[PDB]
């Protein structure tokens, strides 16, 4: 069930006295005319969300509703605020109460306090750990629904509990309908009378007339046209564009090489002047060991480097762990040494099917003795491995590829190919053309760009058009529609009907009359 909240849910935002003044404040208020869930207590006490604050109201004739429970689990496992009003004694506790499956009243505590015809409205919000309670009691004569009217709720209690409250439940006296609303960060114009009592309010987002009233800081609007808010079309999706195939890098001939070199005579391949597509490392799940140092593989297709070096060799499983900075052993010290500040990735996979013979593959060698340890990235050119098909996993051959990334004070030719998306025309999008980003409408154009020209600019030096890197067509960039909202109204002494003018826009993005 739902009812009309009308103008309920306005409370004093602070403890400041004001009079004969209209004060504009932004706080968590109940939006005007919003829907609040209507519960009944006749012939129904569910747990409701708390979100960012809850508006509560009830109508009484026999004091059926006597308390509230606020918390997260309500099962003695966490702290839960308990408020009980029995006859003449208001009781507030924050103990870890063990509540029944259906709490009701018949006819490690850190705080304790002891003190239809009646409408009792409440607001419960938690700001930086402070549980603020507002309320107002007024006589009413209405059973069916909430009375219509306006009444401000004064603060009464402020408990610095610091408790994360996400759910709440009501308490009924069994031998009383209640409403639950939610607060939003709306701006309200509050009217303070000569006695400092709030007598009216304007919700600055209910409708264009309320926006006009807030703009003029008045509850009366003179006849005329007022500018109250700027209209701006929002983008719907992003567009990422890179060439389909600019230039790839020969990573295939490094990993899928027919034959590999020994670890002492490790082979180095230089990668320069090509877009580095690392998706062959992501897709290919045929890798046994994949460890990176100094850089992350996910954030690698969007990062440039001056040069990339691909070192490849063959070792056994017990030695794969030695291909890392700060490692020691025959391979690290005598065959292949990585510096302590190495920035790259180490990849290895079991190559027992390729680098093993029935009589033992002895073509892969390794340096056994040396008078000193190798310097980082040193190649000194011996004992033979000789792998067999029945070797243990630690003694089976492994093909290792070590990618190392350097960044010097020189131009970076190796960066990375980022995935492209489809292009959407005649819609407000957030586009990215070869790294140039912006927001605007992409349309077809008749601008004859020269083969070497990629971007266009207007007199103001802003981007006018771009050439699609995949299909050599020229697309115009028109910034997304924007302007202003003006409200055309006769004075509030005659009518509350208004007309809205959206300045310098078409009647598209928004009894509609198109004017210049």
């Amino acid at each position, epitope marked *: 069930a739902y009812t009309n909240s009308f103008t309920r849910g306005v409370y004093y935002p602070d403890k400041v006295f004001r009079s004969s003044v209209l004060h504009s404040t932004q706080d968590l208020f109940l939006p005007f005319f919003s829907n609040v869930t209507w519960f009944h207590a006749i012939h129904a006490n569910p747990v409701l969300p708390f979100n960012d604050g809850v508006y509560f109201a009830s109508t009484e004739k026999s004091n059926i509703i006597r308390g509230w429970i606020f918390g997260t689990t309500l099962d003695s496992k966490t702290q839960s605020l308990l408020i009980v009003n029995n006859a003449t004694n208001v009781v507030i506790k924050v103990c870890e109460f063990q509540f029944c499956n259906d709490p009701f009243l018949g006819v490690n505590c850190t705080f304790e306090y002891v003190s239809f015809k009646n409408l009792r409205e409440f607001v419960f919000k938690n700001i930086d750990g402070y549980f603020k309670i507002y309320s107002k009691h007024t006589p009413i004569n209405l059973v069916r629904g909430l009375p219509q009217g306006f009444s401000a709720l004064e603060p009464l209690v402020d408990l610095p509990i610091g408790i994360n409250i996400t759910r709440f439940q009501t308490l009924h006296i069994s031998y009383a309908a209640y409403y639950v609303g939610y607060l939003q960060p709306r701006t309200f114009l509050l009217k303070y009378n000569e006695n400092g009592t709030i007598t009216d309010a304007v919700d600055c987002a209910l409708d264009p007339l309320s926006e006009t009233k807030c703009t003029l800081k008045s509850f009366t609007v003179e006849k005329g046209i007022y500018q109250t808010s700027n209209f701006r079309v929002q983008p719907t999706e992003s567009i990422v564009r890179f060439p389909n195939i600019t230039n790839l890098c020969p990573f295939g001939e490094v990993f899928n090489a027919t034959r590999f070199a020994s670890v002492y005579a490790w082979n180095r391949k230089r990668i320069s002047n090509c877009v580095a597509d690392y998706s062959v490392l992501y897709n290919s799940a045929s890798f*046994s060991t994949f460890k990176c140092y100094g850089v992350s593989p996910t954030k690698l297709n969007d990062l440039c480097f001056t040069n990339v070096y691909a070192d490849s060799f063959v070792i056994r*499983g017990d030695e794969v*762990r030695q291909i890392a900075p700060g490692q020691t*052993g*025959n391979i690290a010290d005598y065959n292949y040494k990585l510096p302590d500040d190495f920035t790259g990735c180490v990849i290895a996979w079991n190559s027992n099917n390729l680098d093993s013979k029935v009589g033992g593959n002895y073509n892969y060698l390794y340096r056994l003795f040396r008078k000193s340890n190798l310097k980082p990235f040193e190649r000194d050119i011996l004992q033979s491995y000789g792998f067999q098909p029945t070797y*243990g*996993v*630690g*003694y089976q051959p492994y093909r290792v590829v070590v990618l190392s990334f350097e960044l010097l004070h020189a131009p970076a030719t190796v960066c990375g190919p980022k995935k492209s998306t489809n292009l959407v025309k005649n819609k407000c999008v957030n586009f990215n053309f070869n790294g140039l980003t912006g927001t605007g409408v992409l349309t077809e154009s008749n601008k004859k760009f020269l083969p070497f020209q990629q971007f266009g600019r207007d007199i103001a030096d802003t981007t006018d058009a771009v050439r699609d890197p995949q299909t050599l067509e020229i697309l115009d960039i028109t910034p997304c529609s924007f302007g202003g909202v003006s409200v055309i109204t006769p004075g509030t002494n005659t009518s509350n009907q208004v007309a809205v003018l959206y300045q310098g826009v078409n009647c598209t993005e928004v009894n509609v009359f198109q004017t210049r």
Partner: antibody
Amino acid sequence: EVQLVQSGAEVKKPGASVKVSCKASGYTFTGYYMHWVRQAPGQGLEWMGWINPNSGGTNYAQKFQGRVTMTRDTSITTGYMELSSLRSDDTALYYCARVGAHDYYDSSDNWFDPWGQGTLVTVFS
Amino acid sequence: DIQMTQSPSSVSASVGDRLTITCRASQGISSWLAWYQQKPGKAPKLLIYAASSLQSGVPSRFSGSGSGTDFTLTISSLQPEDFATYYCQQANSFPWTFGQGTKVEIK
């Protein structure tokens, strides 16, 4: 048959050292690590360290670092565990065990299998 | 280091019973867990590795399950020769560590 056969039980005085041997047969000796695990009166199992018989490298549990030495003699496919400065709570059953590799969990080679029969070392005067 | 907690410490069961033994790791070890059986006077023997893989030659009434921190050794149909102490062991990180063991007795 793959088997690990250990040397016989010994009594050693507190402060002395003991050297237990583990002769391997029936498999490629340099192709598997040899680990040592001991079992004290309260039958808990306690890993001590490993030796790589191919490279000669070792790695010891921090509890025994500075007090244990693991070695091997490939020519007779035997591993050794020497524990020095023996104390009363070093009285235990000492096991050698074969482990194929320390990377891939998914293979049966890469767990303790098989084990030696154990060597009871009693530390007493 | 990774602590392995086994439960129960002891269990008495009848021939033909289904028996479950649990092992909890102090942190995630994926599937890097094994189960060993130690019969009286004998060295431990690998039963289950990689949490759920059956060691060759081991009777299939011994099975394992679990991943992460919680692991279970199951004996689906207890036999008199299953009188033994059972140990879990993690291989995720050195030092490799064992549970305290579960003693199985036969009613």
